[PDB]
Amino acid sequence: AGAVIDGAGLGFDVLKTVLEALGNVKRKIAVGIDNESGKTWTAMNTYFRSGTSDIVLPHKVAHGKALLYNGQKNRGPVATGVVGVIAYSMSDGNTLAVLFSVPYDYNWYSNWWNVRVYKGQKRADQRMYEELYYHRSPFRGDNGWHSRGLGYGLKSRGFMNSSGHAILEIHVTKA
């Protein structure tokens, strides 16, 4: 599962459509990551701190392609939201990691996201979640764009909306 498209085509409308495919689950997320890194990406794993997906990370995401992925709250009366880390291996032997955090209760919490390059093949897990959420200055899902250099000749530019029906759009480009 998990579709790929031309990166040039990635945008808010495309991700809204992804979002809408999932239906009115109370908390969910549509994730688009645009690979303009100059390298081929290959899926490693997704670490869900909470929530799940019915789909699989697109296995291969070439330079020039964006991946569309999604996540949703666990079924039933569960209020831990959809919080996770996506990990792709890049053809230079390093890892691109993406954090998403979509809480249940917006009267307490907010959406957050982050992006980071790790040296080597590093699977998403709890230590990476904690680093990206608590240590590495994540960006608020505040309906605004945020840019930052990643090192390693790359940078990120991304956008996350503010709500429980979440949209996360990230572009990883050469710096």
Author numbering: 5 to 179
Sentences from the paper on this structure:
The lytic activity of actinoporins on biological membranes is enhanced by the lipid sphingomyelin (SM) and by lipid-phase coexistence. Here we reveal structures of FraC corresponding to four different stages of its activation route, namely the water-soluble form, the lipid-bound form, an assembly intermediate and the transmembrane pore.
In the monomeric form of FraC, the side chain of Phe16 is inserted in a hydrophobic cavity of the β-core region.
